[PDB]
Every structure is written in structure tokens, then in C-alpha cells.
Amino acid sequence: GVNAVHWFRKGLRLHDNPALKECIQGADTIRCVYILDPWFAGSSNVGINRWRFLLQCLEDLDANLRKLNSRLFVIRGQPADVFPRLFKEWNITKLSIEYDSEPFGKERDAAIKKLATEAGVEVIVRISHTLYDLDKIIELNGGQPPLTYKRFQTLVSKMEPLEMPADTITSDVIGKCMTPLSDDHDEKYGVPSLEELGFDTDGLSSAVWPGGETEALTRLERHLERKAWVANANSLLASPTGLSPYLRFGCLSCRLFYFKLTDLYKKVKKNSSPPLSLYGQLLWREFFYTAATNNPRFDKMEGNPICVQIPWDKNPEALAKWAEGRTGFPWIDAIMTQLRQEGWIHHLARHAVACFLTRGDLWISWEEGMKVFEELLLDADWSINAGSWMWLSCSSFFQQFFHCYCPVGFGRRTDPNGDYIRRYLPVLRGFPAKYIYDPWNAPEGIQKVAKCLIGVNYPKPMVNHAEASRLNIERMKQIYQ
Amino acid sequence: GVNAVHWFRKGLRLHDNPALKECIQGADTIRCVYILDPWFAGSSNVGINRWRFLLQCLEDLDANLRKLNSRLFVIRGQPADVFPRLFKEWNITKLSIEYDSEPFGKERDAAIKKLATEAGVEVIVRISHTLYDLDKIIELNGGQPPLTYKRFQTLVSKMLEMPADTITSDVIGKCMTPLSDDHDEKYGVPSLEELGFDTDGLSSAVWPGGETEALTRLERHLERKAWVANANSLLASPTGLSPYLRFGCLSCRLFYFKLTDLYKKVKKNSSPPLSLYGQLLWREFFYTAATNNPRFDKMEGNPICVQIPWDKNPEALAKWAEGRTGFPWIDAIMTQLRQEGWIHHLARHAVACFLTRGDLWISWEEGMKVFEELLLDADWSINAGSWMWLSCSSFFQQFFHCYCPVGFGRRTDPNGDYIRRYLPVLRGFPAKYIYDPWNAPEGIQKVAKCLIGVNYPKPMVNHAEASRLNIERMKQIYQQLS
Ligand SMILES: Cc1ccc(-n2nc3c(c2NC(=O)c2ccc(C(=O)c4ccccc4)cc2)CSC3)c(C)c1
Ligand SMILES: Cc1ccc(-n2nc3c(c2NC(=O)c2ccc(C(=O)c4ccccc4)cc2)CSC3)c(C)c1
């Protein structure tokens, strides 16, 4: 008969999944697969939050599929080795995927399409990770990706109204489509635990960001309700209505979010032409995906056509202290600790520790910061992470920043009372607000009363910002030439 | 054809702009440009008020140019790299600028003239940032700028130039501005975020930039003064004009004439006193003193600056720069400067004396750098000259008076309203203790809920001890020179 397979990679949801909906059409059987690729492997225990989030997404998908009398099939191995066996054993006729625009996903998917052709399997591809058809954006721009966000905004303004979401997969959508199940399904295709991937979980609290479409749809309605009523040092903390990690994994459709925000704006402000501020970072997300699709070395400086060439220092000792939150600047260290512990930090906090690492203080390549964020950040994948680190290190030709963050000062304006620093660095809980952001300048009496001695209980500033930043500012201006 | 470009740097206005008026004459096209030079980069969020004021000046220029069917072209890059490309691409034949007297500007403008010559572009320079032709003052004085303000007054006594008509739709005539479809994307005015500044913690400006704001303030300022014919003077006034004079949103020559006409109307007299013009001639004086002195902002190697061995104490500087000295008078002024970008002239005297010859004995150069980043109404010449003069670093201006960091505030604002506004942690403290919190009972402290050392910092020096020693240092320095 007609045996269909939907391949989950991103887009880990049943709502607004046009590839899955079209794959079910006319099908006698459906199997939803997720393939754990041993390509992604070798991470240490620091990368646990990404894996935990992913596994919780798969658990949620499996549970939602079970309400449809289906299951999620989790298969371990490389897609190129896995899919030819699946095609033969399940007698597959159709394979569906949500389009992936990133270059190595395009490479992977092109190879899998060749194998599908060899097996006589039709391939269904549908766009649903981004608001727009990125290739149409590139085509409208004469075949090259927009070089600036303003150019991107202008291109997007002329393009056809973004496609509306597809109906959720239901009892009715499935119909008489069925999922054949073996007795040992859970043993052979179950979602893995963290331990099975090798991670230590004995010292592990419950997630601040629980994965999955169910969590995301619940957050969406509360996020919309809170913003209607509205019509800070607590925004540095993880919000129970924050949606960004769910947008990265596809537990929440970005097109549904866009529509729900626009409808909210119309209902609250009684106006049909909202400002860009409404959409937050949705268009910047779309922009970095567009800039990366055709550039397989988007994540590299050397040989990358759109990346200014800058002689960053090689300093792994300084990089580690930055990555591990042991810089001596409580503001910077608190941010890296929150990132390491929970996997999300505020957007302004991302700018602060990125400027600190690259153009501001350490003169270390944006590539190294990207790799640490790649390991630790829940809500940014390869395109957006490479794009943001490039842009924020002044390595994009058309975005020169005139401003350089202060590692002490920026924190004081944001949390005058160092509540944020007292939370993520409790060893400084004694220090008062006048010294909490620069503990080195506190007298030894106030240090001892606080029961933390700089240099012993907490480390001293790793550089002098005034000295370092002035030189790096002079370095960058020379580079422009 | 005849394609003209007017280059805005200062003089961000359409009124009293003789360079732009002459550049338009005989031109087939006109484009007004502002060049964002990456040389000014590297500021932290502390420098946001200057940048915000500038961008609002540019926005206003663009909005007023749009009423003339024109646009402001904002280009990012160095003038020396930008202008040769512009000349070829737009086929420019003339380039106009308002004269800039500062050493840096003269150096930049000489390099751009050489590039213009190489391109076959005629260059138009007209004076309109100052009341007078500064070089004529210098020639009048025998080739050297006046050393003292009184000699300067004497020189201008013997010499103001009159203003040109505002650029109108009639003035533009058949001159037009060719526009690309992507103009806004390519030449639009940048936002603060595009320069890297954090705007999330930012309310609306106390000092909104732009000619339109300045001309509105000018009329209300003149009407208020006609009617009159202080603790609230420490606060920003809705009729204050000084930031607009610095950026050239308000012509200083228009202001001079309107003030003179007001005096003639109200007092029925034709010979006004110098006090009528306030800061206008001191502004002119510092521009004249600096224009030939590229090291005017330095002590060592600067010929008119007395050599004084200030201490290098960056810990003390930061407390002064961040308004954490323990003296609520000094701290309130530095806070108001950081948050808004203007403080009263007498407040400037107070925190300058405190930093240099009064208390901390830190070099006037360091105060100037903090002021250059924070202060909206003083540019390089006036800022360097003011810090030199007020730190007794000018040979011919010796001050016999040392400001008191507690007493001066009390005489100015007895209740302490000013301190309660910019330092609300001391809102509870009564007027007897608000200017010196340390000398107050712990009971009044606890009731006020600010404990010194806990909610606000303690005095960083003993003024009596420090000032006496610094006064002794100063008398010693002068004697070695005499
Ligand atoms: C270091 C870093 C890494 C990743 C992220 N990040 N995460 C996500 C997103 C991003 N980026 C971003 O929004 C992002 C947005 C703008 C710029 C920019 O240049 C720029 C240009 C002009 C004015 C202000 C700014 C750079 C990055 C969007 S979707 C989840 C960030 C903010 C920082
Ligand atoms: C620390 C500081 C920095 C800048 C300024 N400032 N701002 C602006 C201006 C100025 N200066 C000034 O008027 C200024 C005026 C006079 C003297 C002087 O020696 C002096 C000489 C005799 C009697 C009183 C005083 C010093 C500075 C004029 S246009 C905007 C000030 C007052 C202080």
C-alpha cells in the first residue's frame, strides 16, 4: 500500500506541520521518525541542557502521537545508513520533511533525496521553520542574500503575505491511516534517556525550560495574556512565558506566533499596521537564516566572503575563564553561569558577554564564542549563532558599532541592587550594592564582613577594562582603514 | 551640470547658513550630507545623550529638508575615503562647509580641500559658527590669539557679521535633489541601537535635539526674559539654548541680534551691558585661543598652560565621574550631568574646583574627558579652555576663591530639593543634614532610612584638610614661576 514516513528534525510539533499533513494524505500507514545522528556527539556534561530539551521534545511528540494511536520512532545512526534499510523494511513510498535552509542540512537532505529516488520513494518538502520562502527572498534580491537587515526588511515588505498555518494533525486528519507497531517497539524505538546518551543526571534539578510542543502552546497563551495587560532586573531571569527555545526546536510555529501577535496588537491598540518592535526578534531570526543558506563557511572567519578579516588573539586560558564564568567581573560571570546552568540569557546579556570576549576586552575570535553558545544556548542554532557573533564583533562590513559595553557599568544600570549577581554568584551575597559589580574596589573590611575575599574566595578582574578596551577600540578603528 | 553638496558637521540648521545658501546659487542639484566618522567610536552607554542629541538633530534636518523636497544623506565612513567616491558617483562640482576653527577640523578640512582639488571640485567655506572672524581677531592682535578675556573684549570692541536668509522653497528654486529608490535604506539617519547603544532603559530626552526645537525655545526664551526685564535654576530649563548653540541648531548670530533687539525694546537703550550676552563672548574667546593650538587639550607641551604636578588617582577620578564622592552636592551635579547632559554653569565651577585645585588634585585633562563625553553644550575648544582656566592652569587667571563642597550647595538650594531629586536615597534626610549626611545622628539617619556607608557613601576626603594642602600647593607653584 501507501506507507508514509515523516522525518522530524526541527519542527517538533503536530500543529502547523504542512509536510506531515500532506504526507498523511492518501496514506495507508504513517510512521514519524526522529534519527539520533552520532555526528552530533562528544559533548561533555556542559551540553546537557540542549540534550535534555531535545529529549523532552521527543517525549512530548511521542505522547501527543500516542493520543493519535501512533508512536514516535527514534532511530540511532546516520540518516544515509538508516533510510535505505527503513525504506526496504517498511516498504515506504513517501518521505516528508520540513525544509531545512542551513547549508549542511541542505547537503544532508540532498543526499537523502538521492537515496529516496534509488528506493522509489517520493519526497515531500514543505517550508514551516521560517515565516518566508528564503530562496524567493534571495531571488528577489538578484540571486544574492541581502547584506543588511534594512535591505532584508525592504525585500520582505514586497513579498507575498506569509502563508497561513496548516491545521493541526487530529483524529480527523489521520482518518483510517494507521501505525503498525511491533511488540518490542519501546525497546527498539523508545526515546532515550540522558543516561543512555552518557550524561550524569544525579546532580540535576528540574529544567527551567521544559521541552516540547505542549509546554510551548501553554506558554503561548499565557505570553499573549500577559502582554495584553501590559498594552528590569527581573527580565534578566528566565520568564515562564518566554518562547525562544521553543521557536528554535520548532515546538512552537513561528508563523502561528506571528499571527497571534498581530491579532493581539489589532485587538489591544485597534490598529492594523503594527510597528516592527511588535515582532521582537522574529525578523532577525529570518535574516540570519537567509544570510547563511548559501554560505557553508558562515561560521568561519577565514575564507568567508562577508566576514571582515580580523587578527584575533589565540588565548585559550582567557577563553576558558570567559566560558566558565571566572573572569572576575561579576556581571560577566553571572551571565555565563546562568547560561551554563539554564541555557537561556537575556538578549542584552548576550551582547555584553560577546563584546567582552571579542571587540571589547579579550580580542578573542567570535568563532570561539559561537562554539560556547552552540554548546550552551537553547534558542539559537547555527545560522543565527554564527550571524550574531559576526555582527556583534564588528565583523560584518556594514554594521560598525560606535558603542562598547562596560563590564561593570552595564550591570549596575540593569540591576542596581545586585540581585541577579547574588542569585548566580552566592559567594558575593555578602558584598553590598556599592561593591557587588566591582568587588576588587571594596575595602578588606567590607570584604571580610561579606565573608568573601577577592583573589581567594572569588577571582580578581582578569583584565583592566580601561586599558584593554581602549587598545581594542584603537585596534578596531585601524582595521576599518 | 552644476551638482552641489553641502557638508553638515556643526551648523545643523537651515537658517543663517551662508555656506548652504551660496552653494545652492547656480546649482542644478543639491545634496546635504552628514558623514558619520568611525573615529568617534568606542563610547560606552555613558555617552548616549550626545549621540541621541546628534541623531535628533539629523532627524530634524532630514524632516526640514523633506519640506524642500529634499533629504539628508547620512554616510558612514571617514571623510577622506568617502568624498572621492561621492565626487565621482554624483559628479560633484562644488562642495560647501561652515568654517570650523578647531585644530582637528582645520586639519580634516585641509585634507578634504586637497581631495576636492584633485577631483576638480570647487570648495566654499563660510563663517557662521561664531559671531566673529577669529583669524581677523588674531591678526588684529599681531598674529597671536589674545591671552586674556579682557584683551579679547578690547579686540572685538574695534571689530559682528549679519545673518543670511533661511533656505526656503523660493531659495531652492529649480535646484532639486535626485533620489534613489533605496535612499532611506542607504542614507537614512541611524538609530541609537544601530550605533550599539542600549535604549531599553531610556525615557524621553530632557534636551531634544534639532533646529525646530531650538527656534521654538528661542521665542519662549525671549518672551520669558522680556517679562522679567536659585534652586529651580539648577534644573534644566525649557527655554535653555546652550546645547543648540554647540551643535549649530541655533545660530549664535541670530541669538545675539535677538537679544540686542530685546534689550533695546525693553530698556529703551542702545548700549547694552556685556552681561546681556552671558556666555557668548567666553565661547568666542575659547574658540580663538584654541584655533592655533593643537595641544590646547593637554598640559605638557601646551605653551599657555602652567605645568602643575597633579596626582594620578583613577580610583578617585571614577568616584567623581560616577557621582559617588560622599558629598551630595558634588554627587547630585555629576548625576544630573550623566542622566541629562546639562548642569548649571555654577555647578560646573563647583565640580571642576573639587576635582582639580580644590580637593582631589587630579588633572584638569581628566575632568575635560568626562565632560566631553557627558556635556551637551561644550565642545573641544570651550571644554579644554574652561577646565584649564578653572583649575588655575592659565597664567593670567588666578582664583582667590575655593568652592566648598558642602557650603556652596546650601547657599544655592537651602531646602535640598535638588539633592532629593537626583539622590532620592537621601529623600528622608532633613535640610540640616542633606548637604553633609555624615554629621547627623544615627536616629535621623535610620528615620531617613539612609545609613551612611550602607545606603550612600561617606565623604571621600576631608575638605578642610585636602583644600588647605591643595591651596598651599597652588601658592607654591605660582611662586616658582614668579
Ligand atoms: C552573542 C549572541 C548570540 C545569539 C543571539 N541571538 N539569539 C537569537 C537571536 C539572536 N540574535 C539577534 O537577535 C541579533 C539581533 C541584532 C544584531 C545586530 O547586530 C544589530 C544591528 C543593529 C542594531 C542592533 C543590533 C545581532 C543579533 C534571534 S532568534 C534567537 C544574540 C542576540 C547574541
Ligand atoms: C568645567 C567647565 C566646563 C565647561 C564650561 N562651559 N560650558 C560652556 C561655556 C563654558 N565655560 C565658560 O563659560 C567659562 C567662563 C569663564 C571662565 C573663567 O575662567 C572666569 C574668569 C573670570 C571670572 C569668572 C570666570 C571659565 C569658563 C561657554 S559656552 C558653553 C564651564 C563653565 C565649566
Side-chain angles (χ1 to χ4, degrees), chain A residues 1-39 41-45 47-87 89-112 114-121 123-135 137-138 140-157 159 161 165-166 168-175 177-187 189-199 201-224 227-231 233-275 277-316 318-320 322-370 372-396 398-411 414 416-421 423-428 430-433 436-439 441-443 445 447 449-450 452 454-455 459 461-463 465-466 468-469 471-473 475-479, chain B residues 1-21 23-38 41-45 47-84 86-87 89-103 105-113 115-135 137-138 140-149 152-157 159 163-164 167-168 171-173 175-197 199-219 221-223 225-226 228-229 231-273 275-299 301-311 313-314 316-318 320-323 325-368 370-394 396-409 412-419 421-426 428-431 434-437 439-441 443 445 448 452-453 457 459-461 463-464 466-467 469-471 473-477 479 482:
Chain A
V2 181
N3 306 313
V5 168
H6 178 75
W7 179 15
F8 282 114
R9 302 89 61 85
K10 294 171 191 197
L12 306 175
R13 61 182 187 262
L14 297 190
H15 74 270
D16 189 24
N17 194 331
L20 174 57
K21 172 154 147 62
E22 195 214 294
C23 197
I24 294 168
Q25 298 311 106
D28 291 314
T29 68
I30 179 71
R31 301 176 167 83
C32 290
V33 302
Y34 183 95
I35 287 147
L36 244 190
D37 191 351
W39 175 272
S43 151
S44 100
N45 252 318
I48 193 163
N49 284 331
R50 255 192 76 168
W51 282 110
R52 169 161 63 167
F53 196 93
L54 171 70
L55 295 185
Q56 287 177 333
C57 290
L58 299 186
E59 291 280 5
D60 192 68
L61 258 180
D62 187 58
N64 281 319
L65 285 168
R66 273 166 196 266
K67 307 178 177 190
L68 273 36
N69 287 293
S70 207
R71 308 284 166 99
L72 182 69
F73 291 68
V74 180
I75 301 152
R76 301 184 57 155
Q78 311 186 289
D81 307 318
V82 161
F83 270 113
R85 310 179 182 122
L86 280 197
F87 295 148
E89 279 186 359
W90 291 342
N91 188 39
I92 293 316
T93 64
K94 331 198 304 193
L95 165 66
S96 67
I97 49 152
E98 172 183 83
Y99 178 67
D100 181 7
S101 70
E102 310 197 308
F104 45 90
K106 260 154 66 173
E107 183 84 17
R108 171 201 60 203
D109 294 342
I112 300 303
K114 272 185 282 157
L115 292 167
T117 300
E118 188 191 22
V121 175
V123 185
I124 288 160
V125 188
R126 301 293 293 265
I127 305 170
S128 54
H129 191 63
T130 55
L131 305 166
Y132 301 98
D133 193 327
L134 308 180
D135 294 325
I137 302 187
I138 296 176
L140 229 56
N141 207 47
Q144 213 79 295
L147 290 186
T148 66
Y149 184 65
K150 291 151 123 202
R151 185 47 163 195
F152 179 86
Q153 281 189 358
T154 280
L155 285 164
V156 153
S157 74
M159 216 161 336
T168 185
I169 312 296
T170 61
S171 48
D172 313 65
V173 166
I174 296 266
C177 197
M178 149 278 284
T179 302
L181 284 194
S182 297
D183 295 331
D184 54 356
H185 175 87
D186 296 337
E187 158 196 342
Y189 300 115
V191 181
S193 79
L194 278 176
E195 291 83 353
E196 300 179 28
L197 307 191
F199 290 98
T201 68
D202 291 341
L204 205 63
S205 306
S206 70
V208 174
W209 299 88
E213 166 181 24
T214 294
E215 179 69 25
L217 285 185
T218 296
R219 279 165 179 253
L220 181 56
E221 272 279 297
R222 277 150 210 192
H223 174 105
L224 298 173
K227 245 193 229 171
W229 295 32
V230 178
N234 260 81
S235 296
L236 285 175
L237 299 180
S239 153
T241 68
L243 305 169
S244 70
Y246 310 92
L247 297 164
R248 186 268 185 92
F249 288 79
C251 328
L252 168 61
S253 164
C254 71
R255 308 104 75 75
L256 173 71
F257 185 41
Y258 187 101
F259 173 96
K260 285 289 196 157
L261 275 182
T262 304
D263 166 273
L264 182 62
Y265 174 90
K266 291 177 196 163
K267 294 187 306 147
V268 170
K269 286 232 138 196
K270 295 95 154 41
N271 200 75
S272 51
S273 284
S277 91
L278 170 58
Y279 301 105
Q281 317 297 135
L282 283 188
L283 284 156
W284 272 104
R285 174 182 182 272
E286 202 95 355
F287 168 75
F288 284 136
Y289 282 129
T290 307
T293 38
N294 291 336
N295 187 351
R297 309 192 68 255
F298 205 60
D299 60 343
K300 307 268 128 52
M301 183 193 81
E302 252 165 12
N304 181 359
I306 46 91
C307 181
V308 177
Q309 295 312 281
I310 294 167
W312 313 101
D313 296 342
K314 284 312 141 174
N315 189 340
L319 171 52
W322 177 91
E324 295 164 4
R326 304 150 71 100
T327 70
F329 291 88
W331 174 231
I332 306 311
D333 290 341
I335 294 162
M336 300 306 284
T337 294
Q338 177 188 34
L339 175 65
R340 220 174 248 294
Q341 292 180 345
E342 303 167 13
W344 177 95
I345 48 165
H346 194 276
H347 264 48
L348 269 43
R350 305 173 195 206
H351 295 216
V353 300
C355 172
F356 185 81
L357 178 73
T358 60
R359 58 189 186 92
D361 295 63
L362 278 313
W363 206 246
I364 301 198
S365 168
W366 58 270
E367 296 159 288
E368 302 298 320
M370 191 205 160
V372 164
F373 272 28
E374 199 137 288
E375 179 94 322
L376 303 175
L377 243 196
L378 295 171
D379 70 1
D381 54 25
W382 182 91
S383 305
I384 290 132
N385 217 21
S388 299
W389 276 95
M390 261 194 295
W391 258 245
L392 294 167
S393 56
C394 297
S395 317
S396 170
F398 310 93
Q399 189 51 72
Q400 285 108 319
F401 284 115
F402 284 70
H403 168 246
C404 174
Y405 288 95
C406 176
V408 191
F410 194 33
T414 305
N417 239 26
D419 310 332
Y420 178 76
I421 300 208
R423 179 181 295 253
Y424 291 105
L425 309 173
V427 70
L428 311 186
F431 285 88
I436 196 80
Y437 286 100
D438 56 344
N441 297 315
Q447 280 194 26
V449 171
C452 164
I454 312 308
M462 62 183 293
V463 302
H465 180 67
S469 69
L471 172 57
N472 295 335
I473 288 154
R475 273 159 164 172
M476 195 56 76
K477 304 204 320 265
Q478 219 154 18
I479 286 316
Chain B
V2 179
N3 304 314
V5 162
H6 177 74
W7 178 16
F8 281 111
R9 304 88 62 88
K10 296 174 200 198
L12 305 173
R13 62 184 189 261
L14 298 191
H15 75 272
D16 187 26
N17 193 331
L20 173 60
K21 176 84 146 49
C23 195
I24 286 165
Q25 295 275 6
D28 291 309
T29 69
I30 180 71
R31 302 182 169 84
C32 295
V33 305
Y34 182 93
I35 287 130
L36 242 193
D37 193 352
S43 272
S44 99
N45 262 310
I48 189 169
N49 287 331
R50 240 185 87 166
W51 281 110
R52 166 164 63 168
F53 195 92
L54 173 67
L55 297 183
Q56 287 176 333
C57 289
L58 298 190
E59 293 280 1
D60 190 67
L61 254 182
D62 190 60
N64 282 316
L65 284 167
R66 278 161 189 271
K67 306 175 168 187
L68 303 179
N69 287 290
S70 206
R71 307 290 191 268
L72 180 73
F73 296 69
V74 179
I75 299 145
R76 324 191 41 151
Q78 307 191 99
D81 304 321
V82 163
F83 268 117
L86 276 198
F87 294 151
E89 246 159 45
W90 292 340
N91 280 318
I92 297 314
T93 55
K94 36 206 279 210
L95 162 69
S96 66
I97 49 147
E98 171 186 79
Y99 179 66
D100 178 5
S101 61
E102 308 198 304
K106 265 153 64 173
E107 183 87 14
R108 169 202 62 202
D109 291 345
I112 302 303
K113 281 159 184 202
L115 292 170
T117 298
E118 198 184 332
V121 173
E122 165 202 351
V123 175
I124 295 155
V125 184
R126 301 273 200 260
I127 301 175
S128 59
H129 191 66
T130 58
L131 300 165
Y132 300 100
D133 192 325
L134 307 189
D135 291 328
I137 299 181
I138 295 176
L140 204 70
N141 209 45
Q144 223 83 35
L147 299 179
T148 75
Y149 181 61
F152 179 88
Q153 293 181 346
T154 280
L155 285 162
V156 304
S157 74
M159 310 258 295
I167 304 305
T168 63
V171 160
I172 291 298
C175 208
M176 46 90 45
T177 301
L179 285 190
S180 292
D181 299 312
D182 54 0
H183 175 89
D184 296 330
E185 173 209 328
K186 264 163 82 200
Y187 301 118
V189 177
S191 72
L192 281 176
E193 295 86 340
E194 289 180 31
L195 312 176
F197 290 103
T199 57
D200 280 326
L202 205 67
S203 265
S204 66
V206 174
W207 300 88
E211 173 181 13
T212 297
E213 177 75 21
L215 287 180
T216 308
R217 284 171 173 249
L218 180 51
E219 265 277 296
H221 174 110
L222 294 165
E223 305 145 26
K225 284 279 119 194
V228 310
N232 262 69
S233 284
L234 291 176
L235 304 175
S237 147
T239 65
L241 307 172
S242 72
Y244 308 89
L245 299 160
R246 182 266 181 91
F247 288 78
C249 322
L250 167 62
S251 152
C252 59
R253 307 102 74 77
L254 175 66
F255 185 34
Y256 188 102
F257 282 128
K258 284 281 186 146
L259 272 179
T260 304
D261 172 83
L262 182 67
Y263 177 92
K264 289 179 186 175
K265 280 181 176 186
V266 173
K267 300 243 85 172
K268 293 108 151 66
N269 213 75
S270 78
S271 323
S275 68
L276 164 69
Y277 303 102
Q279 54 170 49
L280 275 184
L281 289 155
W282 275 105
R283 179 180 182 270
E284 282 264 336
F285 169 76
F286 288 131
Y287 280 128
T288 304
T291 189
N292 287 333
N293 191 343
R295 298 186 61 74
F296 199 68
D297 59 343
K298 300 262 143 28
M299 178 188 79
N302 174 5
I304 47 84
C305 179
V306 174
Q307 299 312 284
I308 297 172
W310 315 96
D311 300 334
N313 188 336
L317 177 51
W320 179 89
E322 290 156 10
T325 65
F327 301 80
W329 176 232
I330 304 311
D331 284 349
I333 292 159
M334 297 307 287
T335 299
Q336 185 192 25
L337 176 62
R338 273 210 183 283
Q339 296 179 337
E340 299 173 13
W342 177 96
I343 51 162
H344 198 276
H345 262 63
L346 269 43
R348 303 174 201 205
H349 284 71
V351 303
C353 171
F354 179 95
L355 180 68
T356 67
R357 63 189 181 92
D359 295 66
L360 310 183
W361 205 248
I362 293 191
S363 169
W364 60 266
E365 305 174 22
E366 306 283 0
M368 180 206 159
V370 167
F371 271 34
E372 298 281 19
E373 204 64 61
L374 297 182
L375 191 57
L376 296 168
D377 67 2
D379 55 18
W380 184 89
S381 301
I382 299 161
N383 206 212
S386 293
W387 275 95
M388 266 191 47
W389 259 244
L390 293 171
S391 67
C392 298
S393 302
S394 157
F396 309 89
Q397 186 56 67
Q398 303 123 69
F399 287 110
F400 287 48
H401 161 79
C402 184
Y403 285 97
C404 176
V406 191
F408 195 41
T412 299
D413 169 44
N415 217 10
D417 311 327
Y418 177 78
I419 295 207
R421 174 180 297 263
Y422 291 103
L423 302 176
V425 48
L426 321 185
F429 278 79
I434 192 63
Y435 285 101
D436 55 339
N439 295 313
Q445 284 197 23
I452 306 320
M460 54 177 299
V461 299
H463 173 66
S467 67
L469 184 119
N470 293 339
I471 288 155
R473 276 154 151 171
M474 202 67 266
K475 315 208 160 161
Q476 215 151 9
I477 287 315
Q479 210 207 346
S482 324

